[PDB]
Design a protein around this motif. Structure first.
Motif, PDB file in Angstrom:
ATOM      1  N   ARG A   1       6.162 -11.654  17.609  1.00  0.00           N
ATOM      2  CA  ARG A   1       7.582 -11.533  17.897  1.00  0.00           C
ATOM      3  C   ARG A   1       7.883 -10.086  18.242  1.00  0.00           C
ATOM      4  O   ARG A   1       7.143  -9.174  17.872  1.00  0.00           O
TER       5      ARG A   1
ATOM      6  N   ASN B   1      15.027  -0.778   8.103  1.00  0.00           N
ATOM      7  CA  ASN B   1      14.465  -1.065   6.781  1.00  0.00           C
ATOM      8  C   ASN B   1      13.399  -0.042   6.399  1.00  0.00           C
ATOM      9  O   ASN B   1      13.346   0.413   5.247  1.00  0.00           O
TER      10      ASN B   1
ATOM     11  N   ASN C   1       5.823   1.823  -5.772  1.00  0.00           N
ATOM     12  CA  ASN C   1       7.035   1.686  -4.966  1.00  0.00           C
ATOM     13  C   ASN C   1       6.695   1.491  -3.496  1.00  0.00           C
ATOM     14  O   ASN C   1       7.325   0.674  -2.813  1.00  0.00           O
ATOM     15  N   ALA C   2       5.698   2.235  -2.988  1.00  0.00           N
ATOM     16  CA  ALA C   2       5.261   2.046  -1.605  1.00  0.00           C
ATOM     17  C   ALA C   2       4.589   0.693  -1.417  1.00  0.00           C
ATOM     18  O   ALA C   2       4.762   0.041  -0.372  1.00  0.00           O
TER      19      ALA C   2
ATOM     20  N   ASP D   1       4.708   5.919  -8.030  1.00  0.00           N
ATOM     21  CA  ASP D   1       4.874   6.323  -6.633  1.00  0.00           C
ATOM     22  C   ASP D   1       4.118   5.389  -5.705  1.00  0.00           C
ATOM     23  O   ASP D   1       4.637   4.979  -4.658  1.00  0.00           O
TER      24      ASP D   1
ATOM     25  N   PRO E   1      15.916  -7.456   1.231  1.00  0.00           N
ATOM     26  CA  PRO E   1      14.535  -7.716   1.645  1.00  0.00           C
ATOM     27  C   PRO E   1      13.502  -6.946   0.841  1.00  0.00           C
ATOM     28  O   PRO E   1      12.306  -7.164   1.050  1.00  0.00           O
ATOM     29  N   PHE E   2      13.923  -6.068  -0.072  1.00  0.00           N
ATOM     30  CA  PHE E   2      12.998  -5.279  -0.874  1.00  0.00           C
ATOM     31  C   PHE E   2      12.586  -5.975  -2.166  1.00  0.00           C
ATOM     32  O   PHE E   2      12.100  -5.316  -3.089  1.00  0.00           O
TER      33      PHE E   2
ATOM     34  N   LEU F   1       1.863 -10.157  15.185  1.00  0.00           N
ATOM     35  CA  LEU F   1       2.825 -10.937  14.417  1.00  0.00           C
ATOM     36  C   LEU F   1       3.674 -11.863  15.285  1.00  0.00           C
ATOM     37  O   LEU F   1       4.458 -12.644  14.739  1.00  0.00           O
TER      38      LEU F   1
ATOM     39  N   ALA G   1      12.539   5.683  -3.528  1.00  0.00           N
ATOM     40  CA  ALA G   1      11.287   4.931  -3.535  1.00  0.00           C
ATOM     41  C   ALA G   1      10.167   5.653  -2.799  1.00  0.00           C
ATOM     42  O   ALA G   1       8.999   5.280  -2.955  1.00  0.00           O
TER      43      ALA G   1
ATOM     44  N   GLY H   1       4.677  -4.534  14.616  1.00  0.00           N
ATOM     45  CA  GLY H   1       4.200  -5.901  14.514  1.00  0.00           C
ATOM     46  C   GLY H   1       2.701  -6.034  14.485  1.00  0.00           C
ATOM     47  O   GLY H   1       2.180  -7.121  14.747  1.00  0.00           O
ATOM     48  N   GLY H   2       1.987  -4.949  14.169  1.00  0.00           N
ATOM     49  CA  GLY H   2       0.543  -4.919  14.231  1.00  0.00           C
ATOM     50  C   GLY H   2      -0.016  -4.457  15.556  1.00  0.00           C
ATOM     51  O   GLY H   2      -1.224  -4.200  15.648  1.00  0.00           O
TER      52      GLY H   2
ATOM     53  N   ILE I   1       0.309 -13.280   8.555  1.00  0.00           N
ATOM     54  CA  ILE I   1      -0.158 -12.399   7.491  1.00  0.00           C
ATOM     55  C   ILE I   1      -0.163 -10.958   7.992  1.00  0.00           C
ATOM     56  O   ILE I   1      -0.736 -10.657   9.046  1.00  0.00           O
ATOM     57  N   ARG I   2       0.478 -10.073   7.231  1.00  0.00           N
ATOM     58  CA  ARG I   2       0.421  -8.636   7.453  1.00  0.00           C
ATOM     59  C   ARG I   2      -0.665  -8.004   6.591  1.00  0.00           C
ATOM     60  O   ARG I   2      -0.938  -8.461   5.482  1.00  0.00           O
TER      61      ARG I   2
ATOM     62  N   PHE J   1      15.509   1.776  -4.056  1.00  0.00           N
ATOM     63  CA  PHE J   1      15.715   1.621  -2.621  1.00  0.00           C
ATOM     64  C   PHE J   1      17.163   1.853  -2.194  1.00  0.00           C
ATOM     65  O   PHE J   1      17.552   1.423  -1.106  1.00  0.00           O
TER      66      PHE J   1
ATOM     67  N   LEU K   1       5.299  -2.029  -3.084  1.00  0.00           N
ATOM     68  CA  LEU K   1       6.356  -3.032  -3.071  1.00  0.00           C
ATOM     69  C   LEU K   1       6.998  -3.103  -1.694  1.00  0.00           C
ATOM     70  O   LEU K   1       7.193  -4.197  -1.152  1.00  0.00           O
ATOM     71  N   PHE K   2       7.292  -1.947  -1.091  1.00  0.00           N
ATOM     72  CA  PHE K   2       7.845  -1.956   0.259  1.00  0.00           C
ATOM     73  C   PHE K   2       6.931  -2.694   1.231  1.00  0.00           C
ATOM     74  O   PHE K   2       7.373  -3.606   1.943  1.00  0.00           O
TER      75      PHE K   2
ATOM     76  N   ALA L   1       8.414  -6.809   7.049  1.00  0.00           N
ATOM     77  CA  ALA L   1       7.941  -8.028   7.692  1.00  0.00           C
ATOM     78  C   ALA L   1       7.334  -7.787   9.067  1.00  0.00           C
ATOM     79  O   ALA L   1       6.500  -8.585   9.503  1.00  0.00           O
ATOM     80  N   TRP L   2       7.704  -6.711   9.764  1.00  0.00           N
ATOM     81  CA  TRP L   2       7.121  -6.443  11.071  1.00  0.00           C
ATOM     82  C   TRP L   2       6.197  -5.220  11.056  1.00  0.00           C
ATOM     83  O   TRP L   2       5.960  -4.610  12.100  1.00  0.00           O
ATOM     84  N   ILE L   3       5.656  -4.862   9.896  1.00  0.00           N
ATOM     85  CA  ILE L   3       4.746  -3.725   9.760  1.00  0.00           C
ATOM     86  C   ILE L   3       3.365  -4.252   9.391  1.00  0.00           C
ATOM     87  O   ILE L   3       3.200  -4.888   8.344  1.00  0.00           O
ATOM     88  N   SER L   4       2.370  -3.968  10.225  1.00  0.00           N
ATOM     89  CA  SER L   4       1.021  -4.429   9.941  1.00  0.00           C
ATOM     90  C   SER L   4       0.025  -3.487  10.602  1.00  0.00           C
ATOM     91  O   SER L   4       0.327  -2.860  11.619  1.00  0.00           O
TER      92      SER L   4
ATOM     93  N   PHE M   1      13.573   2.875   3.300  1.00  0.00           N
ATOM     94  CA  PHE M   1      12.486   3.159   2.376  1.00  0.00           C
ATOM     95  C   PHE M   1      12.137   4.643   2.371  1.00  0.00           C
ATOM     96  O   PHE M   1      12.128   5.284   1.316  1.00  0.00           O
TER      97      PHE M   1
ATOM     98  N   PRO N   1       9.591  -8.484   2.332  1.00  0.00           N
ATOM     99  CA  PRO N   1      10.156  -8.793   3.656  1.00  0.00           C
ATOM    100  C   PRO N   1      10.789  -7.598   4.349  1.00  0.00           C
ATOM    101  O   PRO N   1      11.004  -7.656   5.563  1.00  0.00           O
ATOM    102  N   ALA N   2      11.076  -6.506   3.636  1.00  0.00           N
ATOM    103  CA  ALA N   2      11.574  -5.315   4.316  1.00  0.00           C
ATOM    104  C   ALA N   2      10.543  -4.721   5.268  1.00  0.00           C
ATOM    105  O   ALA N   2      10.900  -3.901   6.122  1.00  0.00           O
TER     106      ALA N   2
END
Ligand SMILES: NC(=O)c1ccc[n+]([C@@H]2O[C@H](COP(=O)([O-])OP(=O)(O)OC[C@H]3O[C@@H](n4cnc5c(N)ncnc54)[C@H](O)[C@@H]3O)[C@@H](O)[C@H]2O)c1
Ligand SMILES: NC(=O)c1ccc[n+]([C@@H]2O[C@H](COP(=O)([O-])OP(=O)(O)OC[C@H]3O[C@@H](n4cnc5c(N)ncnc54)[C@H](O)[C@@H]3O)[C@@H](O)[C@H]2O)c1
Lengths: 237, 237
Positions: free
Chosen positions: B201, B210, A210-211, A207, A2-3, B199, B219, B232-233, A178-179, B3, A213-214, A221-224, B214, A218-219
């Motif tokens: 879910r 994940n 790399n952050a 540095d 997922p990275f 998000l 990374a 999820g926001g 969208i995140r 990673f 990219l994370f 995907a649930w961070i927003s 990281f 999708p790695a």
């Protein structure tokens, strides 16, 4: 894994040098097709050409992010060249220490450059991200946004607004798939700076990349709605 | 790629189920030798055996993180089994809603379990991480650490202390080559929860794992003192 950014299409602003250049090249290496933009048309072309020489897919365009016609041309060029938009990295920005009695146009410029621009680019990219089934927006803020100090009326307040915009619009665009996250970069290239950096070395553009990219992969995907500070452990701007 | 965790040795506490189990299996897939520990001896052994059967390197041990004899035995067993320690994931913790008039033994237990434990394990691991060339500590906190609500006197306050401990001790061990970060998970597994989750879910253990990978990988070599909320926001506990 997922990275990676397989089949992604990423727009990167301010990408001719420094952090924005590193993100553009890193994202291409991770599988993204990259729309490289910069205030300087030659700098953006240079980076896109270097990405192509190394095997990636990229185009370079001039884009003053404070110019609505330039913003719309970048959106159209991404769609014409690659057919969709899934990642937007708002790296163009600027400013710094200014006196409390600065001219009002200096104070207002900091908000046009650091905040109104990206917001508008986020508005322009979001419907295409939704139609592509989702995406990631990444804003490059500043440690001045969470810090407090002298001569920071315009730079600190505009970058703090970037942080709070990030947290808030995550609610608006989450339902579109969208995140939205932000990175607050530290000092990226002396003895004084190292005294306030627990890890004991200056930061590198890689540095931040790399952050980035994370957070755009999708790695995450649930961070927003997050503001991630990449500073070697330091807290001082 | 940055990673992966090649040649790393990771201690993961509370790893027989849930988030800790996902971290253990993810870290092993990424190259780490994993010391899987849990209050439940047989649960930790089952997770280590599944890691080995999938082709990774792991042992499983009993460890109540509130017991100083167990804490010393886990450090010694990691060094006896794999020769070094480079990653420590302080995932064991607990508590929840409690009335304001709770017995003091309940209030103090939340700090013994959620904070004193991980502080001590971090003390015991740090000199070995420095001799191994550096390392990463990861604390699993909670959104209750930054949120405010009723019935949160012991759980909210103790998880907030974890967040602040993370930020402060990054300054102490940074010069030893050690990064310290935290992840604050949201709702990791209804309509009400989704209503406040942009998000759309519920969170999954693998979302935390994940992010953990990281922050414990090269990374994130210049990231320290951070508290990354994975929600999820959402902002509400
Ligand atoms: N204060 C901090 O802690 C800190 C430190 C470093 C970077 N940053 C932030 O990171 C981002 C990148 O900064 P950097 O240090 O890599 O800058 P840089 O000078 O290394 O490169 C910036 C690039 O952006 C381009 N640019 C400038 N104005 C532009 C505009 N209006 N439209 C489009 N492109 C433009 C420049 O031509 C240049 O190529 C900025 O948003 C900056 O505020 C903050
Ligand atoms: N509040 C939140 O938003 C939230 C949500 C999920 C997880 N978390 C945190 O994540 C961590 C793990 O939670 P989870 O949901 O995966 O738990 P879980 O119930 O799925 O599993 C936790 C594991 O820890 C072990 N454990 C319990 N007490 C222990 C002790 N004293 N010493 C060693 N091991 C022990 C258990 O045996 C179990 O295997 C905890 O620190 C928890 O507080 C917080």
């Amino acid at each position: 894994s997922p990275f990676h950014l397989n089949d992604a299409v990423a727009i990167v602003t301010g990408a001719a040098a420094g952090i924005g250049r590193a993100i553009a090249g890193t994202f291409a290496k991770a599988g993204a097709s990259v729309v490289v933009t910069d205030l300087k048309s030659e700098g953006a072309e240079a980076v896109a050409a270097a990405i192509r020489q190394a095997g990636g897919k990229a185009i370079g365009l001039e884009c003053n992010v404070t110019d609505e016609q330039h913003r719309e041309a970048v959106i159209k060029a991404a769609l014409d060249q690659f057919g969709k938009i899934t990642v937007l990295v708002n790296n163009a920005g600027g400013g710094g220490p200014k006196p409390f009695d600065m001219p009002m146009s200096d104070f207002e410029w900091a908000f046009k450059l650091n905040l109104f621009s990206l917001f508008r680019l986020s508005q322009l990219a979001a419907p295409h991200m939704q139609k592509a089934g989702g995406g990631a927006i990444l804003n490059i803020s500043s440690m001045a946004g969470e810090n407090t100090n002298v001569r920071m009326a315009s730079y600190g307040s505009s970058k703090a607004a970037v942080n709070h915009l990030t947290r808030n619009i995550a609610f608006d665009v989450g339902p579109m798939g969208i995140r939205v996250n932000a990175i607050a970069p530290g000092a990226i290239k002396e003895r004084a700076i190292l005294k306030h950096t627990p890890l004991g070395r200056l930061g590198e553009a890689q540095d931040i990349a790399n952050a980035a990219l994370f957070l755009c992969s999708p790695a995450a995907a649930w961070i927003s709605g997050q503001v991630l500070t990449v500073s070697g452990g330091g807290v001082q701007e």
